[PDB]
Structures are given as structure tokens and as C-alpha cells.
Amino acid sequence: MFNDRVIVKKSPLGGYGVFARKSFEKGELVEECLCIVRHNDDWGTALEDYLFSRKNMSAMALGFGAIFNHSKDPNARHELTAGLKRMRIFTIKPIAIGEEITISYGDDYWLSRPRLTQN
Amino acid sequence: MFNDRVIVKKSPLGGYGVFARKSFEKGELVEECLCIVRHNDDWGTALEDYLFSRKNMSAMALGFGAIFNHSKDPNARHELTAGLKRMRIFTIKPIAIGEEITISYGDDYWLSRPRLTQN
DSSP states (O other), rough: BBOSSSEEESSSSSSSEEEESSSSTTOOEEEEEEEEEEEGGGSSTTTTTTOOOETTTTEEBBTTTTTTOOOOOOOOOEOOOOOOEEEEEEEESOOTTOOEEEEETTTTTGGGGSOOOOO | OOOSEEEEEESSSEEEEEESSOOOOTOOOOEEEEEEEEEEOOSSSTTHHHHHEETTTEEETBBTTTTHHHHHHHHEEEEOGGGGGEEEEEEESOBTTTTEEEEOOOOTBBSOOOOOOOO
């Protein structure tokens, strides 16, 4: 997987990650993708590590949206339109070619609140 | 969403679809994407219309993989590596620019067998 700016590859550390295939300027657009949105309880635990939520809805980002890894020192941020229909990834720092593009452990990510029960 | 060959847009008929942004030859590569794979019962009903399954595993295609619509007269086919880790979409007919790229209602798609119960 790869487009005219990012490339997905196995991270020497964790699993897969999104890496810059070209130099990036601060505040530039990295990726905008559509999301599948359904009520929180419609999702099992399968995507618990990828879903984000707002109110009673959770969304799964398509495109490369769900591949971006979370970092304690992110060089990007994510933005969801109303209704979680669209996700946008914007850099918050310049990004050199080859650097992994990461987002923070946002509060809207299921991952920030593991659950003892689910499905 | 769009790359150096396909573009996602609202279909005048159904919802969203993947359309050729360039002419395509028969048997050519349209898209290869990574998939998230988990046991069948780990998925709720949220993605029931997008998941495919093999044995006791189901997979959600990332990239544009889950956006391709199903047609009774498809101009493409899908292929999953072992373990459903990767999906590949190959044309089975030449495809002109602007034509929607569709796959058949494969037996491996959850959609071919709606369920009365789930999660």
C-alpha cells in the first residue's frame, strides 16, 4: 500500500505504520478518507484497537486512516467531520521522507479506554 | 479518496463506489490492500455488509478494498492471500475511464448469507 505521499510498511518496532514517501510541511494534508459509522454496540472487539467514537457512534477509517500508529510524540493530528463520516490527518510538524507519521492517543479512540467486556 | 488509477465517488444509483480514473486492461491490478483479520465472532454486525470470511476468520479490507461494490455483471474479481492478510482486486475485462469497478457477490462475503442474529 502506498500513494503519492505515504507508504505503509512494517515498523522495525511495532506492526505496520504509515511513513512519509515525500517531505511534508507543517499543517499539510496527509490523508482524508471515508469512514464506516455505526452505533457503538454494533462493533465487536475485532477493531477495538482501531475505532474512534463520538457520543453513541463509532467509526472505522478506510483508506490508510486506520493504519497510522499512535505516538507519545506525534507529528500529526486527526480530525473527524460531523457524524464521523470523514477523517483527515494533518501534520503538526514538518515531516522528512522516511519518518513514520503518527497521531496521539486521542480520547476519542477506543484504545484510550480498554473494556473488560464487549463482543 | 483517489489514487493513480481509481477514484471513490457517490454512485448515482447506490452509495459509494470505486471508479476507474484511467483506462484498465484485462487482468490488470486495480488494488492490493492489507486486511485486519479476527475470528468470525469478534465482529459485530457493524461491518456485516463489508466483511469476507474463510473458515473461522473474517477480514476487513483497508485501503479502497471495502469500497468496491458488488455487481451481477462484475468487471473485476477479488483474491485473498492465505490467512486473509491481503486482498487483491484484478480486472476480468478491460475497463474504460469513468466506469465503476465492481466485483461479484462472492460466497466468501458475509453479504451472501445474512444472519438473523449476531451482535
